[PDB]
Design a protein around this ligand. Sequence first.
Ligand code: CLA
Ligand code: CLA
Ligand code: CLA
Ligand code: CLA
Ligand code: CLA
Ligand code: CLA
Ligand SMILES: CC1=C(/C=C/C(C)=C\C=C\C(C)=C\C=C\C=C(C)\C=C\C=C(C)\C=C\C2=C(C)C(=O)CCC2(C)C)C(C)(C)CCC1
Ligand SMILES: CC1=C(C/C=C(\C)CCC[C@H](C)CCC[C@H](C)CCCC(C)C)C(=O)c2ccccc2C1=O
Ligand SMILES: CC1=C(C/C=C(\C)CCC[C@H](C)CCC[C@H](C)CCCC(C)C)C(=O)c2ccccc2C1=O
Ligand code: SF4
Lengths: 148, 80, 39, 739, 137, 33, 60, 148
Amino acid sequence: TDYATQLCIFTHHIWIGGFLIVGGAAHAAIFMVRDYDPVVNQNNVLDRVIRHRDAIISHLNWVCIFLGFHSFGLYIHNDTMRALGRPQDMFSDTAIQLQPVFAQWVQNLHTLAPGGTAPNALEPVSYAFGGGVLAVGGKVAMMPIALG
Amino acid sequence: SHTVKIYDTCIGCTQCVRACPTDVLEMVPWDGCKAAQVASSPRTEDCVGCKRCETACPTDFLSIRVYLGAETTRSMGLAY
Amino acid sequence: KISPVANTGAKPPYTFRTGWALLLLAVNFLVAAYYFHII
Amino acid sequence: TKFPKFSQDLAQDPTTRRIWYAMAMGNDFESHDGMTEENLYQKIFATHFGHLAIIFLWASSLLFHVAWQGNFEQWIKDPLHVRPIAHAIWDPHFGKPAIEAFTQAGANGPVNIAYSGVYHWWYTIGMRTNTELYTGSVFLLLFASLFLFAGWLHLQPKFRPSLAWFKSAESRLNHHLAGLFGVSSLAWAGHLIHVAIPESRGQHVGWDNFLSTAPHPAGLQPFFTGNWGVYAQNPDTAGHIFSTSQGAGTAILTFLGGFHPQTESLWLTDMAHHHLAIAVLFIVAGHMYRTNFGIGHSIKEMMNAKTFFGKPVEGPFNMPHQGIYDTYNNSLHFQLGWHLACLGVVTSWVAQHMYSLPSYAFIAKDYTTQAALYTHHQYIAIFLMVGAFAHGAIFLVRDYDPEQNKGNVLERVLQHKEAIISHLSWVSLFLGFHTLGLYVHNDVVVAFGTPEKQILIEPVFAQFIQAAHGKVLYGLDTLLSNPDSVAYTAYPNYANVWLPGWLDAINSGTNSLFLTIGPGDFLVHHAIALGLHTTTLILVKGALDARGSKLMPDKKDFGYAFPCDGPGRGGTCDISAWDSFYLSLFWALNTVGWVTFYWHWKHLGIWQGNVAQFNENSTYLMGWFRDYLWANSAQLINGYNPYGVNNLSVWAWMFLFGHLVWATGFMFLISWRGYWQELIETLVWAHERTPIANLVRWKDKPVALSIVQARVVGLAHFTVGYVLTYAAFLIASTAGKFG
Amino acid sequence: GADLTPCAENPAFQALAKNARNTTADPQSGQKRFERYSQALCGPEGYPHLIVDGRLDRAGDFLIPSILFLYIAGWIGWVGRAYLQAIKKDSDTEQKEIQLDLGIALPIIATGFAWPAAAVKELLSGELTAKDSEITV
Amino acid sequence: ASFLSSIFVPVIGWVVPIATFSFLFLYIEREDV
Amino acid sequence: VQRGSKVRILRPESYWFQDVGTVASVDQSGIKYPVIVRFDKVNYAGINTNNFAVDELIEV
Amino acid sequence: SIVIFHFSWKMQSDVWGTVDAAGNVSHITGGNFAQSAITINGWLRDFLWAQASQVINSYGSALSAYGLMFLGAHFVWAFSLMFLFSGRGYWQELIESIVWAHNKLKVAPAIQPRALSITQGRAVGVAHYLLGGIATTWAFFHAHILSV
Ligand code: CLA
Ligand code: CLA
Ligand code: CLA
Ligand code: CLA
Ligand code: CLA
Ligand code: CLA
Ligand SMILES: CC1=C(/C=C/C(C)=C\C=C\C(C)=C\C=C\C=C(C)\C=C\C=C(C)\C=C\C2=C(C)C(=O)CCC2(C)C)C(C)(C)CCC1
Ligand SMILES: CC1=C(C/C=C(\C)CCC[C@H](C)CCC[C@H](C)CCCC(C)C)C(=O)c2ccccc2C1=O
Ligand SMILES: CC1=C(C/C=C(\C)CCC[C@H](C)CCC[C@H](C)CCCC(C)C)C(=O)c2ccccc2C1=O
Ligand code: SF4
């Protein structure tokens, strides 16, 4: 019901974890420049990673370019088409649609779980996956998050 | 490619020749009767413009200088 | 050492500099006198 | 490979660097291999002709499309309530709803509305038919054809001028003032009197009948007989209607001085009188010099002079100017760095006057055109002002000889180089600490619910200038506002014919002429002073430090544009004189935003009839975000919405376009090369190891962009986004609301 | 100017005084504030606009605060200069900048009540051609 | 007269780039100029 | 000059141009720039010393 | 920063809202996420321009400090661009000329002044760039829900 707390509590921890993950990569490099001994790391999982670092990065470079085109470019195509006056050519729900069927697929299982899988549970684990609207006072606490 | 010029204010620290990764520099004997030695730049094609020598020379202003010029495969450090 | 970094050739009073400055200063006082409606 | 013939160095480059740097210094003839001074000036001279041709051909484009695709006829009948259209648009991508949106201003097909103001200029000056524009375009096509032929002509050996001919300074200056400026100004008075002014009163005067009809009923004898007053005998009436005989006066030269009531623009009769007086002084100024006939001044003798009537002097104003004449004529960058400054100031001099004193009919009421013109020239005014210091820095590097000067003012300037840079830091710091804290004091104190505690101080002495021109709203009763004063009535000669018309325009308050300044106008004016001081500090520092500085004494050797010197002495990141230009252009753009947001918000309140929202909310900065930026952007963002598309869909797309371009530059500015070249080596490994793509391979080895190149690419992105973004806001906010 | 009037004749100032918005803990701080700002000139907004022309009538706007700064500001700079020059005579000068020698500073901080008297006395403020001149021009 | 735009727009967007880039690429990759 | 004397520099392209300092040593040899000088103010590298020729120095 | 918006705009649009006793839910923004979150202008229009109305209008209220904190962060952000875009070489030269003025008046410092290191300049920027970014959306998230 306190929508103020949920976003601030959600937003706060989301930022804290992002900072710490970056620190994990920094000290990973500090270990290398400082404490990496080639005698210890001889044909192990780590030495074998350093010896083909080019293939790891080159393919990751390809994925970053693949997604950035086909993730942000679709916004540009919709932004271009809506300005051109062609709302039927966009990537939208009424137009060409890209449904997250795999997430809709996993969502349906958790709603039907309390019956069949883990049957002792009465309600679904979270109403975000599915179920019914929960109302505390006039505010909605949680409801199914449809994915389109 | 590049041009490494060595000026009169050398004193023979031998720090420039050590800092060079590509061995562009060399310490040669100077005709000065009381001057022990002086630097040189015989193989300038292999200079990679990293300016480590300029950081090493301890004169008030640097006896050695590296002037950037026409690039090539060796100067640009391209293994490919 | 071809060019001296510091300038030379002037006496304490600086008559030429002060003469033009006071003129530029006087006209400033004049425009103020018109603003204050003194004139 | 020999792509750059001007550079054997870049041609012998296996990488792809040769392609980029060749684009850069392909226009730098001074750096071209095997270029003497004689061939240098000659190659520069021919290039001017080609550049001159691009102007007139571009001018022809404006006339052709307005003739073929413009409603210039319909706009004449109702200039206020008809939108001028620049050109048609043929995009296959446009959907049917969009074509219906751009079918505007009575066009059969889709079209763009014009905002340049040419319709008001061509209409005021005498054009009243579309076929007349076709003659102007075809004339400029042939007029440009002459220069293109001249440019090729003067490259042949028989016609190639000599270096001494180029270095002739007195002759070029003598001819330009009299013939280029003066006779053109004299000629311009001819068209105004023979074509524009007659057409303004309804008399059609074209090429067919300009010999028959007379500009004045009296002939040309009153000029020779001394009867000058006949031309100013009867003036146009206040009830005159433009392009018609109603209220028409017969005078061709007058000095009324005010605006036309209907058009809210200056009198055509005064403009013709104006250029004639200008042409006289300019022609008089021409003959001063010593060109060949033995009579006149030698600038070299005047500069190198060392004596009064009998007394000794160091020089003009007792200041040494020994080698100034040789420094000017010999160095090309000195002239270029100088001329762009003079042209940059004049560009601002234009813009300050175009909104204040509109010289075209029905242009003040066309609010969008009035704003784009001011924003246009001010942006242009600053590139020329910023480019002026860049060449001034280049001159000190390569074209400056200390021995030739040896004690002039220029050698005396650089000797106290530290005081110039130092005190400039004080002025910029002294403004920003105090200027911001007042905005910030007013921001906070208004936020706490006590706006009365705001530090509001009137621009008092600036009111005294407004009152010194006749504005009575302030009530100072100063020189021209006070009738008892001598300036209101010149006691020796009661010939202040300017005063009746001028006092009407200021004290009217309808137009924008010395508009009412307020406390909000105070602070923003000082913010502008900071942008001009700090931008000067950056440019002056690098220029004066271009020959050398403490961290790099021998900066003269490397040149203007070099990336660094290395991590030695803990730095060397941005030490060149090029990087001073680099960091200055950020201010030079920002300094406009403080100027243009000031212009736009102040005028929008006037045009909309709400002067309060500026004077009230411009003290605290939050008004700039809320009243000006947030509110006015509503129709822009709604250019294309889920419901449909309006005519403002282009600007919204352009608005987001500059945003992306503005942010793309942050990459080249923030992320530097060494990260990228390592990334490039991996892609090279993959392509050389991918089986089917092994067949195709680069001829030029791919490397990361250089350090100076990335700076260039980054700032161009920062500037393009800065330009296109404010353009879409400037046009759509004004056009959607129409003021 | 610019439609600037006194406070009481201006209706805007009369209305804003009712909406107090008491700053401090005192309940009548809002009323006492507006009454004190009755001396200044008020515009159409009712907000006081201060004239920094230099009029002796409006000296409290800018002139009196102006002198109060420069006396304080010269106190700060003149104290820092004398403390800095005093350190230069001692052996280890760099350390005293960080770890202040209060035996030297506090007597100097006590002075500065009359910095202009000392300032005009020092016609030689250490300026010469013997400073950092830093390549030829 | 509006048919001119249907012929001049595409050649500016397609024919002129293809001709310029094709010539420029072969010009810069030439061994002797 | 005398060893231990306080001396000013006139050599340009120097960090200590027109700055005073003590002469630590003087080489009685034909080497150019024989005099050795020490300073309190560091350059950017942090050296506090460099050799100079006698003509480039004026005694204070 | 996109993760917190994907959470912020969706929940306001699809989940969070007021519910009637009959069973009809009236979300905060009314399903605008479906058609507007597929174009960059929709985020600029329906999420940034719209939801930030409470912040700019927060002056003279209890949320007035959020309007200040939302704004002071913008200053701190652009202040970052000094250190990222620039370089030490400019700044040490400028400090050299300023040092001469202090030598002139004999206010020269014992600890000789030096520009910030190269790594530090990059460090000081990202410190400001992030602090100006996070602090900006921090107040925007607060004042929006605290009013709504
Ligand atoms: C996929 C997106 C897309 C594309 C491809 C186009 C394509 C086009 N639009 Mg368009 N448009 C779009 C989306 C798009 N539109 C959207 C979303 C809107 C908003 C509703 C519009 C609104 C719009 C208007 C209002 C107009 C166009 C016009 C045009 C045409 C311009 C052709 C021209 O003059 O030569 C190309 C144009 C140039 C300026 C040259 C390139 C400029 C570069 C930056 C500089 C050139 C030098 C270069 C860098 C050096 C190398 C080149 C070498 C040859 C030297 C072209 C067919 C115009 C039209 O109808 O045709 C006359 C027109 O007036 N568009
Ligand atoms: C008006 C007169 C004028 C003249 C004759 C010159 C002439 C010269 N300048 Mg100069 N300059 C001028 C004005 C002028 N400039 C102005 C106004 C400025 C301030 C910005 C500068 C700033 C400047 C700098 C900083 C430098 C020069 C340099 C030079 C020399 C080399 C030119 C060069 O590199 O090729 C030109 C090469 C180019 C790549 C230019 C085109 C690039 C533009 C920015 C691309 C923009 C992108 C695109 C078109 C927009 C797309 C729109 C989007 C919506 C799609 C040459 C002597 C250079 C030099 O070394 O001097 C010796 C140098 O370092 N000038
Ligand atoms: C909005 C600004 C912006 C943009 C668009 C990019 C874009 C990119 N950055 Mg980046 N970057 C930026 C700001 C930006 N950066 C800033 C400010 C910094 C400093 C912190 C960095 C630091 C940085 C690093 C350190 C790295 C990147 C990387 C990347 C690449 C990721 C690959 C990708 O998304 O596919 C490409 C996607 C796009 C370019 C998006 C738009 C493309 C549209 C959909 C297509 C265009 C339409 C059409 C083809 C146009 C034709 C026009 C015709 C007339 C010519 C990409 C080139 C990474 C990289 O290069 O590795 C892959 C990487 O390691 N950047
Ligand atoms: C990068 C993202 C992206 C994507 C996915 C699309 C997708 C599309 N755009 Mg679009 N567009 C984009 C960005 C994008 N756009 C941008 C950035 C702009 C602005 C410039 C536009 C502007 C635009 C316009 C103006 C128009 C489109 C149109 C279209 C549609 C037709 C595509 C077409 O004819 O190409 C044909 C494509 C191909 C021939 C090749 C595609 C690549 C294949 C599938 C690669 C497969 C690789 C394979 C899996 C690997 C094999 C492995 C091997 C071992 C076997 C399509 C839905 C049109 C439309 O009306 O939309 C409905 C249209 O008129 N676009
Ligand atoms: C009377 C004789 C005469 C005339 C008319 C000219 C004319 C010209 N010479 Mg020239 N020249 C002459 C004698 C003459 N020369 C002699 C004797 C020599 C040898 C000593 C030279 C040597 C020479 C060189 C070496 C060069 C020229 C160049 C030029 C051109 C300058 C560019 C231009 O058009 O600027 C136009 C300038 C103006 C119109 C005036 C300045 C702009 C003002 C501010 C406009 C007035 C304000 C007004 C409000 C504007 C409103 C605009 C309107 C649309 C609203 C111009 C065509 C240059 C050139 O372009 O190369 C071909 C060049 O490089 N000349
Ligand atoms: C909003 C962004 C911003 C701001 C505030 C500044 C501010 C400044 N820049 Mg700058 N700059 C910027 C963006 C910005 N720049 C960008 C994007 C670039 C392009 C790279 C540059 C490029 C640039 C150059 C090239 C130069 C400057 C210079 C200056 C200074 C000019 C002196 C002045 O006006 O004093 C006014 C100063 C201010 C208003 C800021 C002072 C700080 C505040 C008001 C007080 C601090 C107290 C603090 C709040 C309390 C402590 C809290 C605790 C947590 C520690 C000033 C510090 C020039 C300079 O330093 O020479 C003198 C100079 O040469 N800048
Ligand atoms: C010889 C001579 C005399 C005879 C003079 C006669 C009998 C005629 C001379 C006429 C003249 C001197 C005509 C001027 C012609 C040039 C013209 C008409 C055009 C200039 C146009 C320009 C430069 C470009 C204009 C542009 C275009 C084209 C547009 O469409 C829009 C505006 C703008 C962009 C500006 C007299 C007896 C006196 C004295 C004795 C000697
Ligand atoms: C991305 C990036 C690169 C890599 C960028 C590269 C290799 C450029 C690749 C761009 C290709 C060539 C496409 C660009 C095409 C342009 C849209 C048109 C340019 C053509 C004009 C000449 C007409 C650097 O090398 C670099 C170096 C130093 C600081 C920052 C950076 C940096 O940020
Ligand atoms: C501005 C800037 C500088 C110069 C920044 C400096 C010199 C910051 C100095 C900060 C403080 C204010 C210096 C003085 C601290 C005093 C101790 C404060 C006085 C004590 C009272 C406040 C109590 C760089 O060195 C730099 C380097 C590399 C890339 C970019 C940049 C860059 O942008
Ligand atoms: S520009 Fe690059 S190489 Fe030069 S000093 Fe800065 S970080 Fe080092």
